[PDB]
Design a protein around this nucleic acid. Structure first.
Ligand code: MG
Ligand code: MG
Ligand code: MG
Ligand code: MG
Ligand code: MG
Ligand code: MG
Ligand code: MG
Ligand code: MG
Ligand code: MG
Ligand code: MG
Ligand code: MG
Ligand code: MG
Ligand code: MG
Ligand code: MG
Ligand code: MG
Ligand code: MG
Ligand code: MG
Ligand code: MG
Ligand code: MG
Ligand code: MG
Ligand code: MG
Ligand code: MG
Ligand code: MG
Ligand code: MG
Ligand code: MG
Ligand code: MG
Ligand code: ZN
Ligand code: ZN
Lengths: 144, 60, 50, 67
RNA sequence: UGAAAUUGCAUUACGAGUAAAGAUGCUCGUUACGCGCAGCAGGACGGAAAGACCCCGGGACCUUUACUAUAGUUUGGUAUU
RNA sequence: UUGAAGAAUGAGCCUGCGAGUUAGUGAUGCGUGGCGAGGUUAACCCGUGGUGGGGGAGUCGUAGCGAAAGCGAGUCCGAUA
Protein backbone atom coordinates (compact mmCIF):
# COMPACT_ATOMS: atom_id res chain seq x y z
CA UNK A 1 0.00 0.00 0.00
CA UNK A 2 3.07 2.24 -0.21
CA UNK A 3 2.15 3.69 -3.65
CA UNK A 4 4.68 5.46 -5.86
CA UNK A 5 4.30 8.97 -4.43
CA UNK A 6 5.39 7.94 -0.91
CA UNK A 7 8.80 6.72 -2.11
CA UNK A 8 11.40 9.26 -0.98
CA UNK A 9 15.18 8.93 -0.59
CA UNK A 10 17.05 8.75 2.67
CA UNK A 11 17.96 12.14 4.19
CA UNK A 12 21.36 13.10 2.83
CA UNK A 13 21.29 10.54 0.01
CA UNK A 14 20.66 13.07 -2.79
CA UNK A 15 22.96 16.03 -2.20
CA UNK A 16 21.98 19.03 -4.30
CA UNK A 17 24.24 20.10 -7.15
CA UNK A 18 26.12 23.35 -6.57
CA UNK A 19 25.58 25.45 -9.69
CA UNK A 20 28.48 27.84 -10.17
CA UNK A 21 28.47 31.27 -11.77
CA UNK A 22 24.80 32.06 -11.10
CA UNK A 23 25.00 35.37 -9.23
CA UNK A 24 26.91 36.59 -6.19
CA UNK A 25 24.58 35.06 -3.65
CA UNK A 26 26.44 31.84 -4.44
CA UNK A 27 29.72 30.98 -6.17
CA UNK A 28 29.20 33.74 -8.73
CA UNK A 29 31.38 35.70 -11.14
CA UNK A 30 34.79 34.02 -10.86
CA UNK A 31 33.06 30.77 -9.79
CA UNK A 32 35.59 29.93 -7.07
CA UNK A 33 38.63 30.59 -9.28
CA UNK A 34 39.92 33.94 -8.02
CA UNK A 35 41.29 36.60 -10.35
CA UNK A 36 43.81 36.32 -13.22
CA UNK A 37 46.58 33.76 -13.68
CA UNK A 38 46.66 30.21 -14.94
CA UNK A 39 44.08 28.98 -12.43
CA UNK A 40 41.54 31.48 -13.72
CA UNK A 41 41.26 29.62 -16.98
CA UNK A 42 42.51 26.06 -17.21
CA UNK A 43 44.37 24.00 -14.55
CA UNK A 44 47.94 23.04 -13.55
CA UNK A 45 49.39 19.56 -14.25
CA UNK A 46 50.30 17.55 -11.17
CA UNK A 47 53.75 16.63 -12.51
CA UNK A 48 54.55 20.35 -12.82
CA UNK A 49 56.46 21.98 -9.95
CA UNK A 50 56.74 25.50 -11.36
CA UNK A 51 60.02 24.88 -13.20
CA UNK A 52 62.02 23.43 -10.32
CA UNK A 53 63.08 19.83 -10.89
CA UNK A 54 60.00 17.94 -9.63
CA UNK A 55 59.80 15.19 -7.02
CA UNK A 56 59.39 12.45 -9.65
CA UNK A 57 62.65 13.58 -11.27
CA UNK A 58 64.87 14.57 -8.32
CA UNK A 59 64.33 11.20 -6.62
CA UNK A 60 66.50 8.31 -7.85
CA UNK A 61 64.68 5.50 -9.59
CA UNK A 62 64.06 2.42 -7.51
CA UNK A 63 65.96 -0.03 -9.64
CA UNK A 64 65.71 -3.78 -9.48
CA UNK A 65 63.69 -6.01 -11.75
CA UNK A 66 60.44 -7.97 -11.87
CA UNK A 67 60.41 -11.75 -11.85
CA UNK A 68 58.38 -12.66 -14.97
CA UNK A 69 57.38 -16.05 -13.52
CA UNK A 70 56.75 -15.13 -9.89
CA UNK A 71 53.61 -16.74 -8.50
CA UNK A 72 51.93 -15.49 -5.33
CA UNK A 73 50.43 -17.75 -2.68
CA UNK A 74 46.99 -17.27 -1.20
CA UNK A 75 48.10 -17.37 2.43
CA UNK A 76 45.96 -18.65 5.30
CA UNK A 77 46.92 -18.37 8.96
CA UNK A 78 46.39 -20.88 11.75
CA UNK A 79 43.94 -18.60 13.56
CA UNK A 80 41.72 -18.59 10.46
CA UNK A 81 41.98 -22.37 10.15
CA UNK A 82 41.06 -22.73 13.83
CA UNK A 83 38.08 -20.37 13.50
CA UNK A 84 36.63 -21.82 10.29
CA UNK A 85 37.41 -25.47 11.20
CA UNK A 86 36.94 -25.65 14.98
CA UNK A 87 35.21 -29.00 15.48
CA UNK A 88 38.31 -31.17 15.34
CA UNK A 89 38.76 -30.37 11.67
CA UNK A 90 40.23 -33.60 10.38
CA UNK A 91 41.41 -32.89 6.82
CA UNK A 92 41.41 -29.44 5.26
CA UNK A 93 41.96 -29.27 1.51
CA UNK A 94 42.22 -26.29 -0.81
CA UNK A 95 38.57 -26.85 -1.75
CA UNK A 96 37.51 -26.43 1.90
CA UNK A 97 39.38 -23.16 2.48
CA UNK A 98 38.29 -21.89 -0.95
CA UNK A 99 34.76 -22.66 0.23
CA UNK A 100 35.39 -20.50 3.27
CA UNK A 101 37.80 -17.90 1.84
CA UNK A 102 41.09 -18.52 0.05
CA UNK A 103 40.25 -17.19 -3.43
CA UNK A 104 40.37 -20.43 -5.48
CA UNK A 105 42.54 -21.24 -8.54
CA UNK A 106 45.66 -20.20 -6.60
CA UNK A 107 48.39 -21.69 -4.42
CA UNK A 108 47.46 -21.93 -0.75
CA UNK A 109 50.55 -21.65 1.49
CA UNK A 110 49.52 -21.79 5.16
CA UNK A 111 51.24 -19.45 7.62
CA UNK A 112 51.70 -19.60 11.34
CA UNK A 113 50.30 -16.69 13.35
CA UNK A 114 47.97 -18.14 15.97
CA UNK A 115 47.96 -20.99 18.46
CA UNK A 116 45.97 -23.82 16.77
CA UNK A 117 44.79 -25.88 19.72
CA UNK A 118 42.80 -28.15 17.37
CA UNK A 119 44.28 -30.99 15.30
CA UNK A 120 44.20 -30.53 11.52
CA UNK A 121 45.59 -32.32 8.45
CA UNK A 122 46.24 -29.66 5.80
CA UNK A 123 47.09 -30.87 2.30
CA UNK A 124 48.16 -27.56 0.71
CA UNK A 125 50.87 -26.06 -1.48
CA UNK A 126 53.76 -24.94 0.76
CA UNK A 127 53.79 -23.87 4.42
CA UNK A 128 55.97 -21.91 6.80
CA UNK A 129 58.29 -23.63 9.25
CA UNK A 130 56.41 -22.11 12.19
CA UNK A 131 53.04 -23.23 10.81
CA UNK A 132 54.34 -26.76 10.26
CA UNK A 133 55.78 -26.88 13.78
CA UNK A 134 52.51 -25.66 15.33
CA UNK A 135 50.42 -28.08 13.26
CA UNK A 136 52.63 -31.05 14.17
CA UNK A 137 52.66 -30.12 17.86
CA UNK A 138 48.87 -29.80 17.86
CA UNK A 139 48.75 -33.40 16.56
CA UNK A 140 48.23 -32.95 12.80
CA UNK A 141 50.30 -32.75 9.64
CA UNK A 142 50.77 -31.07 6.27
CA UNK A 143 51.07 -32.60 2.81
CA UNK A 144 51.79 -31.58 -0.80
CA UNK B 1 62.52 5.53 -64.69
CA UNK B 2 61.76 3.98 -61.31
CA UNK B 3 59.12 1.38 -62.26
CA UNK B 4 60.05 -2.01 -63.69
CA UNK B 5 58.01 -3.02 -66.74
CA UNK B 6 58.51 -6.60 -65.50
CA UNK B 7 57.32 -7.35 -61.94
CA UNK B 8 56.02 -3.76 -61.42
CA UNK B 9 58.68 -2.82 -58.87
CA UNK B 10 58.14 0.72 -57.59
CA UNK B 11 59.94 3.13 -55.25
CA UNK B 12 59.64 2.86 -51.48
CA UNK B 13 59.30 5.83 -49.15
CA UNK B 14 61.11 6.29 -45.86
CA UNK B 15 63.23 8.62 -43.79
CA UNK B 16 66.54 10.35 -43.72
CA UNK B 17 67.60 9.73 -40.12
CA UNK B 18 70.58 11.94 -39.19
CA UNK B 19 72.71 11.96 -36.05
CA UNK B 20 70.08 14.18 -34.41
CA UNK B 21 67.28 11.88 -35.71
CA UNK B 22 65.45 14.81 -37.35
CA UNK B 23 63.63 12.65 -39.87
CA UNK B 24 63.06 13.85 -43.43
CA UNK B 25 61.02 12.20 -46.17
CA UNK B 26 63.00 10.43 -48.90
CA UNK B 27 62.69 7.76 -51.57
CA UNK B 28 64.31 4.45 -52.52
CA UNK B 29 64.11 3.82 -56.18
CA UNK B 30 64.68 0.45 -57.85
CA UNK B 31 67.81 0.06 -59.96
CA UNK B 32 65.98 0.45 -63.27
CA UNK B 33 67.98 0.01 -66.49
CA UNK B 34 66.72 0.73 -70.01
CA UNK B 35 67.68 -2.23 -72.20
CA UNK B 36 66.89 -3.49 -75.69
CA UNK B 37 64.69 -6.59 -75.73
CA UNK B 38 63.55 -8.87 -78.53
CA UNK B 39 60.38 -10.60 -77.35
CA UNK B 40 58.33 -12.68 -79.81
CA UNK B 41 60.32 -11.08 -82.62
CA UNK B 42 59.49 -7.54 -81.44
CA UNK B 43 62.47 -5.24 -80.85
CA UNK B 44 61.94 -2.52 -78.26
CA UNK B 45 63.22 -0.76 -75.15
CA UNK B 46 62.21 -1.85 -71.67
CA UNK B 47 62.78 -0.31 -68.24
CA UNK B 48 63.62 -3.39 -66.17
CA UNK B 49 65.11 -3.79 -62.72
CA UNK B 50 68.45 -5.48 -62.13
CA UNK B 51 66.63 -8.19 -60.15
CA UNK B 52 64.71 -9.23 -63.26
CA UNK B 53 67.93 -8.87 -65.25
CA UNK B 54 69.74 -11.23 -62.87
CA UNK B 55 66.80 -13.66 -62.76
CA UNK B 56 66.74 -13.81 -66.56
CA UNK B 57 63.11 -12.66 -66.75
CA UNK B 58 63.76 -10.45 -69.81
CA UNK B 59 64.81 -11.63 -73.28
CA UNK B 60 67.68 -9.56 -74.65
CA UNK C 1 95.10 15.99 -12.17
CA UNK C 2 97.37 17.19 -9.38
CA UNK C 3 95.34 15.54 -6.57
CA UNK C 4 93.72 12.55 -8.29
CA UNK C 5 91.39 9.93 -6.88
CA UNK C 6 93.13 6.63 -6.13
CA UNK C 7 91.50 3.27 -5.40
CA UNK C 8 92.97 1.06 -2.67
CA UNK C 9 92.43 -2.66 -3.27
CA UNK C 10 93.34 -5.57 -1.01
CA UNK C 11 96.53 -7.46 -1.82
CA UNK C 12 94.70 -10.71 -0.99
CA UNK C 13 91.33 -10.65 -2.78
CA UNK C 14 91.89 -7.72 -5.20
CA UNK C 15 88.79 -6.05 -3.73
CA UNK C 16 88.59 -2.33 -4.53
CA UNK C 17 87.62 -1.46 -0.99
CA UNK C 18 88.59 2.20 -0.58
CA UNK C 19 88.92 5.40 -2.60
CA UNK C 20 90.88 8.47 -1.49
CA UNK C 21 93.21 11.14 -2.91
CA UNK C 22 96.94 11.87 -2.93
CA UNK C 23 99.29 14.42 -4.52
CA UNK C 24 101.04 12.39 -7.27
CA UNK C 25 104.11 14.61 -6.74
CA UNK C 26 104.64 14.13 -3.01
CA UNK C 27 103.79 10.43 -3.48
CA UNK C 28 104.83 9.53 -7.05
CA UNK C 29 104.59 5.79 -6.37
CA UNK C 30 101.65 3.59 -5.42
CA UNK C 31 100.59 3.81 -1.78
CA UNK C 32 100.63 0.95 0.71
CA UNK C 33 98.16 1.17 3.59
CA UNK C 34 96.89 -1.14 6.33
CA UNK C 35 93.14 -1.04 5.81
CA UNK C 36 90.24 -3.31 6.76
CA UNK C 37 88.96 -5.69 4.08
CA UNK C 38 85.24 -6.46 4.49
CA UNK C 39 85.78 -9.62 2.43
CA UNK C 40 88.94 -10.86 4.15
CA UNK C 41 87.24 -9.84 7.44
CA UNK C 42 90.47 -8.44 8.93
CA UNK C 43 93.10 -5.75 8.42
CA UNK C 44 95.06 -6.42 5.24
CA UNK C 45 97.52 -4.44 3.16
CA UNK C 46 95.80 -2.30 0.53
CA UNK C 47 97.64 -0.99 -2.51
CA UNK C 48 96.77 1.66 -5.08
CA UNK C 49 95.43 0.10 -8.26
CA UNK C 50 97.57 0.14 -11.40
CA UNK D 1 39.05 6.41 -20.95
CA UNK D 2 41.18 4.81 -18.25
CA UNK D 3 43.54 7.37 -16.75
CA UNK D 4 47.18 6.28 -16.99
CA UNK D 5 49.72 6.42 -14.19
CA UNK D 6 52.88 8.53 -14.17
CA UNK D 7 55.82 6.45 -15.35
CA UNK D 8 58.50 8.25 -13.34
CA UNK D 9 56.28 8.02 -10.28
CA UNK D 10 55.77 4.32 -11.04
CA UNK D 11 59.54 3.88 -11.07
CA UNK D 12 60.46 6.10 -8.10
CA UNK D 13 58.01 5.69 -5.19
CA UNK D 14 56.77 2.75 -3.13
CA UNK D 15 53.56 2.66 -1.10
CA UNK D 16 53.77 0.69 2.14
CA UNK D 17 51.06 -1.43 3.73
CA UNK D 18 49.81 1.35 6.01
CA UNK D 19 49.78 3.82 3.11
CA UNK D 20 53.08 5.66 3.51
CA UNK D 21 54.84 6.90 0.36
CA UNK D 22 58.57 6.21 0.34
CA UNK D 23 61.36 7.14 -2.06
CA UNK D 24 65.01 6.17 -2.38
CA UNK D 25 67.43 8.63 -0.79
CA UNK D 26 68.99 11.00 -3.32
CA UNK D 27 72.65 11.94 -3.60
CA UNK D 28 74.58 8.66 -3.60
CA UNK D 29 74.75 7.74 -7.30
CA UNK D 30 78.23 9.20 -7.87
CA UNK D 31 80.77 11.68 -6.48
CA UNK D 32 81.02 9.47 -3.40
CA UNK D 33 84.75 9.72 -2.62
CA UNK D 34 84.55 13.03 -0.76
CA UNK D 35 81.35 11.91 0.98
CA UNK D 36 82.11 10.25 4.29
CA UNK D 37 80.69 6.92 5.39
CA UNK D 38 78.32 8.89 7.62
CA UNK D 39 77.05 11.00 4.72
CA UNK D 40 76.76 7.92 2.50
CA UNK D 41 74.90 6.04 5.25
CA UNK D 42 72.51 8.99 5.58
CA UNK D 43 71.79 8.75 1.83
CA UNK D 44 71.59 4.94 1.66
CA UNK D 45 68.09 4.04 2.88
CA UNK D 46 64.50 5.06 2.17
CA UNK D 47 62.66 8.30 2.99
CA UNK D 48 59.01 8.65 3.97
CA UNK D 49 57.50 11.49 1.96
CA UNK D 50 56.02 14.67 3.39
CA UNK D 51 52.27 15.26 3.31
CA UNK D 52 52.09 17.46 0.22
CA UNK D 53 54.64 15.44 -1.73
CA UNK D 54 52.93 12.18 -0.74
CA UNK D 55 49.55 13.52 -1.87
CA UNK D 56 51.12 14.62 -5.16
CA UNK D 57 52.63 11.15 -5.63
CA UNK D 58 49.33 9.38 -4.91
CA UNK D 59 47.70 11.72 -7.42
CA UNK D 60 50.34 10.98 -10.08
CA UNK D 61 49.98 7.23 -9.46
CA UNK D 62 46.74 6.04 -11.06
CA UNK D 63 45.94 3.73 -8.21
CA UNK D 64 49.25 2.12 -9.10
CA UNK D 65 50.67 0.60 -5.89
CA UNK D 66 54.09 2.07 -6.58
CA UNK D 67 56.97 -0.22 -7.39
C1' U E 1 12.63 65.93 -47.64
C1' G E 2 15.80 64.27 -44.11
C1' A E 3 20.98 61.54 -41.94
C1' A E 4 25.67 60.76 -38.88
C1' A E 5 29.41 59.96 -35.61
C1' U E 6 28.32 59.65 -30.22
C1' U E 7 25.40 58.43 -25.82
C1' G E 8 26.08 55.43 -17.57
C1' C E 9 23.17 59.35 -16.03
C1' A E 10 21.36 64.72 -15.54
C1' U E 11 17.49 70.47 -13.38
C1' U E 12 25.39 69.36 -16.17
C1' A E 13 28.03 77.50 -12.88
C1' C E 14 32.61 79.98 -10.82
C1' G E 15 36.81 80.67 -7.22
C1' A E 16 40.17 78.61 -3.53
C1' G E 17 40.87 73.78 -1.83
C1' U E 18 40.47 68.23 -1.37
C1' A E 19 40.70 63.56 -3.77
C1' A E 20 43.91 57.99 -8.12
C1' A E 21 48.23 64.04 -6.72
C1' G E 22 44.74 68.75 -13.10
C1' A E 23 36.58 68.27 -10.21
C1' U E 24 29.82 70.56 -13.67
C1' G E 25 28.92 66.12 -9.62
C1' C E 26 33.19 66.32 -2.94
C1' U E 27 34.33 70.82 0.93
C1' C E 28 33.98 76.11 2.17
C1' G E 29 32.32 80.21 -0.10
C1' U E 30 30.71 83.39 -4.58
C1' U E 31 27.39 84.05 -8.31
C1' A E 32 22.99 82.65 -10.89
C1' C E 33 14.88 84.10 -13.27
C1' G E 34 12.61 80.01 -17.27
C1' C E 35 13.29 78.83 -22.63
C1' G E 36 15.49 79.68 -27.15
C1' C E 37 18.51 81.62 -31.95
C1' A E 38 23.21 82.75 -34.38
C1' G E 39 28.30 82.25 -33.45
C1' C E 40 33.74 80.89 -31.20
C1' A E 41 36.49 76.91 -29.77
C1' G E 42 39.03 77.14 -23.29
C1' G E 43 37.21 72.47 -20.97
C1' A E 44 34.18 67.94 -20.72
C1' C E 45 41.97 64.71 -19.68
C1' G E 46 36.21 66.04 -26.40
C1' G E 47 35.06 62.01 -30.73
C1' A E 48 37.59 58.66 -34.05
C1' A E 49 41.43 54.06 -33.80
C1' A E 50 41.70 47.41 -27.34
C1' G E 51 49.09 53.54 -28.75
C1' A E 52 52.07 52.43 -34.01
C1' C E 53 56.71 55.35 -29.20
C1' C E 54 58.52 52.23 -24.48
C1' C E 55 58.57 47.54 -21.74
C1' C E 56 56.62 42.36 -21.25
C1' G E 57 54.62 37.57 -23.75
C1' G E 58 53.82 35.54 -28.73
C1' G E 59 54.59 35.74 -34.07
C1' A E 60 56.36 36.70 -38.81
C1' C E 61 60.04 37.73 -42.33
C1' C E 62 65.48 38.86 -43.16
C1' U E 63 70.88 37.67 -42.00
C1' U E 64 75.06 34.82 -40.74
C1' U E 65 81.82 31.69 -39.75
C1' A E 66 74.18 30.18 -34.21
C1' C E 67 72.22 24.86 -34.01
C1' U E 68 70.16 20.85 -36.58
C1' A E 69 68.74 19.23 -41.12
C1' U E 70 68.07 19.17 -46.41
C1' A E 71 67.45 20.04 -52.36
C1' G E 72 71.47 20.72 -55.39
C1' U E 73 76.83 19.89 -56.37
C1' U E 74 80.86 16.63 -55.66
C1' U E 75 84.13 11.67 -53.85
C1' G E 76 84.76 6.78 -54.04
C1' G E 77 82.63 1.64 -53.67
C1' U E 78 79.08 -1.67 -55.66
C1' A E 79 74.94 -3.25 -59.55
C1' U E 80 73.99 -2.49 -64.55
C1' U E 81 79.29 -4.71 -66.42
C1' U F 1 43.46 47.94 -8.50
C1' U F 2 47.71 49.78 -2.75
C1' G F 3 43.75 53.13 -4.06
C1' A F 4 38.34 54.69 -8.83
C1' A F 5 32.63 59.27 -8.18
C1' G F 6 36.72 59.21 -10.74
C1' A F 7 39.27 63.00 -16.01
C1' A F 8 41.25 54.32 -15.76
C1' U F 9 37.91 49.97 -18.70
C1' G F 10 32.82 48.55 -20.64
C1' A F 11 27.77 49.88 -21.25
C1' G F 12 22.57 54.59 -25.97
C1' C F 13 17.85 51.91 -24.36
C1' C F 14 14.44 47.72 -24.26
C1' U F 15 13.08 42.61 -25.60
C1' G F 16 15.05 37.92 -26.78
C1' C F 17 19.54 34.80 -26.76
C1' G F 18 24.84 34.18 -24.45
C1' A F 19 29.64 30.79 -20.12
C1' G F 20 31.29 25.17 -15.04
C1' U F 21 28.50 20.49 -19.24
C1' U F 22 28.81 15.30 -20.80
C1' A F 23 31.36 10.43 -21.26
C1' G F 24 34.22 6.62 -18.67
C1' U F 25 32.59 -1.34 -15.48
C1' G F 26 38.95 6.48 -15.00
C1' A F 27 41.71 8.63 -9.92
C1' U F 28 40.55 10.29 -4.98
C1' G F 29 37.18 11.87 -0.93
C1' C F 30 32.35 12.52 1.38
C1' G F 31 26.83 11.46 2.15
C1' U F 32 23.48 7.51 1.53
C1' G F 33 21.50 2.44 0.56
C1' G F 34 22.53 -3.03 -0.17
C1' C F 35 25.53 -7.12 1.16
C1' G F 36 29.32 -8.29 4.38
C1' A F 37 34.98 -11.79 5.37
C1' G F 38 33.32 -11.07 1.63
C1' G F 39 31.40 -7.32 -2.41
C1' U F 40 30.51 -7.06 -7.53
C1' U F 41 29.93 -8.53 -12.53
C1' A F 42 32.01 -7.30 -18.28
C1' A F 43 31.00 -9.06 -22.96
C1' C F 44 27.25 -12.05 -23.76
C1' C F 45 22.45 -15.32 -23.38
C1' C F 46 16.95 -15.51 -22.40
C1' G F 47 12.57 -12.11 -21.90
C1' U F 48 10.62 -9.84 -29.38
C1' G F 49 7.04 -8.29 -23.18
C1' G F 50 10.65 -3.23 -20.41
C1' U F 51 13.28 -1.44 -16.35
C1' G F 52 13.55 -8.72 -15.20
C1' G F 53 16.56 -13.14 -14.81
C1' G F 54 21.15 -15.66 -15.82
C1' G F 55 26.55 -15.06 -16.88
C1' G F 56 31.73 -14.75 -11.43
C1' A F 57 35.61 -14.54 -17.07
C1' G F 58 37.81 -10.93 -14.38
C1' U F 59 38.31 -7.51 -10.39
C1' C F 60 38.91 -5.17 -5.19
C1' G F 61 39.46 -7.12 0.09
C1' U F 62 41.69 -11.55 2.41
C1' A F 63 49.71 -10.44 4.71
C1' G F 64 53.58 -8.23 4.53
C1' C F 65 58.66 -7.41 3.63
C1' G F 66 62.58 -7.76 -0.23
C1' A F 67 65.91 -5.71 -6.53
C1' A F 68 64.71 -10.61 -6.65
C1' A F 69 65.39 -15.84 -5.50
C1' G F 70 62.49 -16.07 -1.44
C1' C F 71 60.87 -16.05 3.48
C1' G F 72 56.50 -14.97 6.01
C1' A F 73 53.70 -11.91 11.40
C1' G F 74 57.42 -11.09 9.92
C1' U F 75 60.84 -9.44 6.38
C1' C F 76 65.13 -6.51 4.54
C1' C F 77 70.41 -4.12 5.42
C1' G F 78 73.20 -7.46 8.63
C1' A F 79 77.47 -12.01 10.64
C1' U F 80 71.31 -17.75 11.71
C1' A F 81 74.41 -10.61 15.06
MG1 MG G 1 29.42 40.67 -11.50
MG1 MG H 1 38.61 39.03 -14.88
MG1 MG I 1 47.28 39.18 -9.47
MG1 MG J 1 45.19 31.84 -8.70
MG1 MG K 1 48.41 15.39 -19.89
MG1 MG L 1 47.24 22.09 -6.12
MG1 MG M 1 65.98 25.81 -14.32
MG1 MG N 1 75.89 -9.92 -60.88
MG1 MG O 1 75.81 2.35 -8.57
MG1 MG P 1 82.11 5.24 0.43
MG1 MG Q 1 45.57 67.62 -3.21
MG1 MG R 1 38.64 74.30 -9.05
MG1 MG S 1 25.28 66.14 -4.90
MG1 MG T 1 24.15 77.85 -28.79
MG1 MG U 1 33.71 74.98 -35.62
MG1 MG V 1 40.01 61.06 -26.95
MG1 MG W 1 46.87 48.38 -26.04
MG1 MG X 1 61.38 34.02 -33.37
MG1 MG Y 1 80.61 8.89 -59.08
MG1 MG Z 1 42.80 43.27 -4.11
MG1 MG a 1 48.11 51.95 -10.64
MG1 MG b 1 34.01 56.70 -16.76
MG1 MG c 1 32.70 61.44 -15.74
MG1 MG d 1 42.71 46.47 -19.35
MG1 MG e 1 32.32 53.64 -24.55
MG1 MG f 1 38.14 -16.48 -11.00
ZN1 ZN g 1 61.53 -6.13 -62.16
ZN1 ZN h 1 91.06 -8.00 0.64
Amino acid sequence: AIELHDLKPAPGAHKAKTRVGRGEGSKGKTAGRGTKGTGARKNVPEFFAGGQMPIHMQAPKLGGFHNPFRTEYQVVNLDKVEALFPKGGKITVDDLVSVGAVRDNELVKVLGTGELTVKVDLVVDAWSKSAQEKIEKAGGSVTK
Amino acid sequence: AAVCDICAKRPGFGHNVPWSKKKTNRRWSPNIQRVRVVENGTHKRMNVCTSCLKAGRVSR
Amino acid sequence: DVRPKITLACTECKERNYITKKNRRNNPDRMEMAKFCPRCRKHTAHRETR
Amino acid sequence: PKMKSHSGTKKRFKVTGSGKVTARKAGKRHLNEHKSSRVTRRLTGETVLSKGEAAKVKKLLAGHPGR
